[PDB]
Amino acid sequence: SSSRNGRDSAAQRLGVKRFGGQVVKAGEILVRQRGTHFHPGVNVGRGGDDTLFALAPGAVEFGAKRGRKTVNIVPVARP
Amino acid sequence: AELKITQVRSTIGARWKQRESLRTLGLKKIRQSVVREDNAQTRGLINTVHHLVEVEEVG
Amino acid sequence: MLIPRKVKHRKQHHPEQRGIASGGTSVSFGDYGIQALEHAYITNRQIESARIAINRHIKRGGKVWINIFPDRPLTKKPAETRMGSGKGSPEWWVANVKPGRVLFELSYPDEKTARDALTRAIHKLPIKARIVTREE
């Protein structure tokens, strides 16, 4: 007459936060995730909870490097 | 080549991109028509609202 | 009765019962088969009745292939009870059938007896089916 379940946790709002070709500031976090689904690419660092962030200003762009999806920051030219 | 677009249906019950495509075409009421160039932007803009308008080329 | 020895989850959603059978639409084991034409939930009750019908009709020697398995459980909450208090306990088993899927297949020497046993089986099913031969 009772359900032995009915509990869940809060949604953590994970996922890609900046997509390809998007200009970011240095320090912006770019994708929140659990494991390493996206590996840190060139000029992109990885946080303690596996959060990828940008170590330099530029444009986001994804890639594959030896069978590993990677995220990179590309230096846009100064006008 | 360029087209004339005449609105035949109305926007009651119409979804929002359809009404906005009609507004972007510059026509507001039924039986109102506009004339415009036959590029890909217009072709898509009327592809959205083909059920609401009718078009014919000039010449 | 055909019952799976265990299912990973014992309370699933109702099988989506749309589309045309893509897999399992040909007669391969025996020479004549029963091939479906409507979406349904063929329970193990129907399958057992149909198989016994075929065996009673042919009754001598011939192979009956039940190439569908009832392994999807439909639950039913106990009677006289209101809505709520969670999902019920599973208490019958089902194969999800699409129009196109050969349900039963038969191998037997002659023609008319085989056809008659197949239609005897068909009468026990909740769907329209047709007898299909090993050739195009």
């Binding site: - | - | 045309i20 893509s22 198989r51 042919i58 009754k59 020697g61 011939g62």
Partner: protein, 192 residues
């Protein structure tokens, strides 16, 4: 034993798509594609009625002589996409072929004759793969059952294979297995 190619007419599909295919299928025509070493996937409508007629007369595996707008080509049916229910042929695949060309194919195997009465003959593999020339392709080949002894298996390696044709399947693929006819107290003991 050369098989005479069958003469169909075909004409190039003007425009492609599911709408075009549905319309053509609605006008009693079959959409099909030529390919092979002709290195040109060529999209051809052909008569549905004549296609079905020649497939009846000479099975799935039969050479055709296609008349493409006057040009004359030799073709061989590679695959047929058929509806599971309405059973109409939807699409056809046509390798281009010429004389003296070995090609791999799948040929139906129809057991012939009566067996010894106490047991039933049952085929597991109805089709056997063979390597054979374009014209010399057998539409069907037979396997012998004439009063076998007690239950025994038959494999592709002991079949009377035609001349000019070569087995492709591994010789130890079972085709027809004679299995003892279930007794009264054995037939209804399996299935639950």
């Amino acid at each position: 034993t050369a098989n005479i190619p069958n003469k169909l007419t075909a004409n190039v599909r003007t425009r492609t798509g599911k709408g075009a295919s549905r319309q053509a299928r609605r006008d009693g025509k079959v959409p099909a594609v030529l390919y092979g070493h002709g290195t040109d996937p060529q999209h051809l409508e052909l008569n549905a009625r004549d296609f079905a007629a020649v497939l009846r007369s000479h099975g799935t595996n039969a050479i055709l002589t296609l008349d493409i707008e006057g040009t004359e080509q030799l073709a061989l049916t590679k695959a047929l996409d058929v509806h599971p229910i309405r059973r109409n042929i939807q699409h056809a695949d046509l390798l281009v072929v010429q004389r003296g060309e070995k090609v791999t194919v799948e040929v139906t195997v129809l057991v012939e004759g009566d067996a010894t009465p106490g047991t039933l003959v049952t085929q597991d593999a109805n089709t056997i793969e063979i390597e054979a020339e374009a014209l010399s392709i057998p539409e069907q080949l037979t396997v012998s059952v004439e009063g076998v002894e007690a239950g025994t298996q038959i494999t592709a390696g002991q079949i009377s294979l035609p001349e000019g044709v070569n087995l492709i399947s591994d010789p130890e693929l079972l085709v027809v297995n004679v299995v003892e006819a279930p007794s009264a107290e054995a037939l209804e003991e399996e299935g639950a």
